[PDB]
Amino acid sequence: KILVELAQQQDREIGDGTTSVVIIASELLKRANELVKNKIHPTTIITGFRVALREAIRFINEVLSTSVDTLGKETLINIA
Amino acid sequence: EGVQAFIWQEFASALEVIPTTLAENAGLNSIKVVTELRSKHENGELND
Amino acid sequence: DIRLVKKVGGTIDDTEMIDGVVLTQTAIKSAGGPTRKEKAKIGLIQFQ
C-alpha cells in the first residue's frame, strides 16, 4: 500500500509518470531481496544506497543536458 | 561478600546484553567487544 | 507549548520554524479573499 501512495505524492511534485515512471519503484525490491537472504544486514545495504543516491544526483548532473540553443519550439514540441 | 556477592555480580553483568545486542545488528562479535572492554575500561578510561 | 503542524508534500529538509501562528483549518473561501493584509490585528471570538 505504500507503493500505491507514491502516485499521489508524485503527481503533486511532478504531475506525470503513472503510465511510465512509477514502474521504477517495482524492481527496487527485486534485487534487494536476494541480498538480505544471506549475510549482509539491510542497514549496510540501505546505507550503501544512501551513499550511492547522494552521488547519483551528481552523476545525473554530469550526463545532464540543459535546454538551450534549440531552434524554435522543437524543445517544447519534443517534450509534448 | 555475603549472599549478595554473586547476586550483585549477575545484576552488574545483566547490562552486558545492551552492548551485545548492538553488536548483533552491526555484525560484530560479542566476545571480541567484551574482551576489549575489560582492557579498555582499565585503559581507555571512561570517555573512550 | 510547542505546536506541530502537518503539511502534505515537500521534504523534511525544508521543515523550519515559523515566526507566526499556523492553523490546520482555514476560511470557507466562498466569496472573500482577505488573504495578505498589512498591519492587521488578530482577534479571538469564542461566541458563535
Side-chain angles (χ1 to χ4, degrees):
Chain A
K1 294 177 179 177
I2 295 171
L3 297 175
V4 176
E5 294 178 350
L6 296 176
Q8 294 178 336
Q9 64 181 21
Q10 185 174 355
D11 290 344
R12 185 182 297 275
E13 182 67 14
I14 296 171
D16 189 4
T18 59
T19 60
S20 178
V21 177
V22 68
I23 306 301
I24 191 167
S26 63
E27 71 280 4
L28 295 175
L29 296 175
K30 182 177 179 180
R31 294 184 181 276
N33 192 340
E34 297 302 321
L35 296 175
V36 297
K37 289 189 295 184
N38 291 336
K39 182 180 293 296
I40 304 301
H41 189 277
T43 299
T44 300
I45 297 169
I46 293 170
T47 57
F49 296 160
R50 295 173 62 186
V51 64
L53 178 63
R54 181 179 180 273
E55 295 301 321
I57 304 301
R58 182 177 64 84
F59 295 159
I60 295 171
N61 290 336
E62 296 301 321
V63 69
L64 176 63
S65 178
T66 59
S67 178
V68 67
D69 291 344
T70 59
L71 177 63
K73 294 176 179 177
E74 183 178 2
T75 298
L76 296 175
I77 294 170
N78 290 336
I79 302 300
Chain B
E1 294 177 351
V3 63
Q4 70 284 359
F6 59 90
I7 295 171
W8 293 356
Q9 294 178 336
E10 183 67 14
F11 177 80
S13 63
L15 296 175
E16 295 177 350
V17 297
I18 295 170
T20 300
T21 300
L22 295 175
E24 294 177 350
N25 291 336
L28 296 175
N29 189 340
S30 178
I31 292 173
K32 183 174 178 290
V33 175
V34 175
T35 299
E36 292 177 350
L37 293 175
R38 299 293 180 86
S39 296
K40 299 300 183 181
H41 296 291
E42 296 301 321
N43 290 283
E45 291 178 350
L46 185 63
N47 290 336
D48 184 4
Chain C
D1 291 344
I2 296 170
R3 179 60 178 165
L4 276 66
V5 176
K6 295 177 179 178
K7 180 179 76 179
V8 176
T11 59
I12 296 171
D13 290 344
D14 291 344
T15 298
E16 63 184 343
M17 294 183 286
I18 304 301
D19 59 353
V21 175
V22 177
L23 296 175
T24 299
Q25 294 300 321
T26 187
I28 297 170
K29 294 181 181 297
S30 183
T35 61
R36 180 182 294 177
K37 179 62 174 172
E38 183 178 2
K39 294 177 179 177
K41 294 177 179 177
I42 295 170
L44 178 62
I45 295 171
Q46 292 178 334
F47 60 90
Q48 295 177 336

